[PDB]
Design a protein around this ligand. Structure first.
Ligand SMILES: [Cl-]
Ligand SMILES: [Cl-]
Length: 164
């Protein structure tokens, strides 16, 4: 199991533009196109991202390309963020993937906001962080996904993802 497989399980693969859980236009493996209500705007972002007139539909290969760019981007945003970097560096391989997952999902800004949980992770206080992480809109809006990520941080194994 690795980050790619992990996020593939959490995001699915869709070849036509769709609305994510917050109602935003997305495509592929969780690639947000725009927060804008306009399908046209979505359509425009997609063509620009792909480099072709897509008509709101992409191929598997194209989906995968956006996915690789997105994972890379998530890693670099962490490394560049002053609040994220130290946490990431203190963690083992499996827990690093849980941090990337959150960043991919909510952005570096969103995650950097979890001050208290970050601190507990940095201290290696797994159960306590797990409890803190759960007290969030994140956990209340997407509880299944959140539980998988949280379990990953608590246990440091891929158990939550095996079977999927
Ligand atoms: Cl892009
Ligand atoms: Cl969920």
């Amino acid at each position: 199991m690795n980050i790619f497989e992990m996020l593939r399980i959490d995001n699915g693969l869709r070849l036509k533009i769709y609305k994510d859980t917050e109602g935003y236009y997305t495509i592929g493996i969780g690639h947000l196109l725009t927060k804008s209500p306009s399908l046209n705007a979505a359509k425009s972002e997609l063509d620009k991202a792909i480099g072709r007139n897509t008509n709101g539909v992409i191929t598997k290969d194209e989906a995968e390309k956006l996915f690789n760019q997105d994972v890379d981007a998530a890693v670099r945003g962490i490394l560049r963020n002053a609040k994220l970097k130290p946490v990431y560096d203190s963690l083992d391989a499996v827990r690093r993937a849980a941090l990337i997952n959150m960043v991919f999902q909510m952005g570096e800004t969103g995650v950097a906001g979890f001050t208290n949980s970050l601190r507990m992770l940095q201290q290696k206080r797994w159960d306590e962080a797990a409890v803190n992480l759960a007290k969030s809109r994140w956990y209340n809006q997407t509880p299944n996904r959140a539980k998988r990520v949280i379990t990953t941080f608590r246990t440091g194994t891929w158990d939550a993802y095996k079977n999927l």
